[PDB]
């Protein structure tokens, strides 16, 4: 999927790697990245792959309450994840639907 790589690579990877490049050029740092497309297009794998490539941690919020100890739930845990991500910077926070649960 030659088309897919160039699009993802610009959005996510360049700013985490260097925001400085983005800043000199004069672009605003990416807020949201929306992934859409049919099931079975390697979207979940690509998210994981991207983390390895930048050398950034992959913090998956799975919607478990087994995972959560930060406040033991996550839908008012907005900023507490952002603080800790900044500490262990860069990171990409991932929200996932498996479409089965």
């Amino acid at each position: 999927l030659d088309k897919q790589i160039k699009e993802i690579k610009e959005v996510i990877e360049l700013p985490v790697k260097h925001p400085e490049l983005f800043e000199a050029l004069g672009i605003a740092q990416p807020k949201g990245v929306l992934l859409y497309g049919p099931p079975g297009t390697g979207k979940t794998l690509l998210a994981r792959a991207v983390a390895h490539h930048t050398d950034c941690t992959f913090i998956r919020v799975s919607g478990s309450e087994l995972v959560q100890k930060f406040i033991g739930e996550g839908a008012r845990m907005v900023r507490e994840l952002f603080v800790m991500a900044r500490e262990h910077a860069p990171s990409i926070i991932f929200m996932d639907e498996i479409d089965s649960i």
């Binding site: 998956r60 799975s62 478990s64 087994l66 100890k69 498996i98 649960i101």
Partner: protein
């Protein structure tokens, strides 16, 4: 206190699970029958490599089973 213990027990288990790869041992085998009363964190791969499927039997498959019990 109850909810926290079970949560701790499971983290320790994940941590020890990852320990197997260095040594000859084959990892945990577990059954999910209802997956909605289970964490999706526990269904994620990277510790799983092989996932077994069982479906419902068909007619021919079923017939064989029925002879063994009888």
């Amino acid at each position: 206190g109850a909810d926290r213990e079970v949560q701790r027990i499971l983290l320790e288990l994940l941590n020890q699970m990852d320990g197997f790869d260095q040594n000859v041992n084959v990892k945990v085998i577990m059954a999910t029958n209802r997956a909605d009363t289970l964490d999706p964190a526990l269904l994620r791969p990277g510790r799983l490599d092989r996932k077994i499927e069982f479906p419902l039997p068909d007619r021919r498959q079923k017939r064989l089973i029925f002879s063994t019990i009888t």
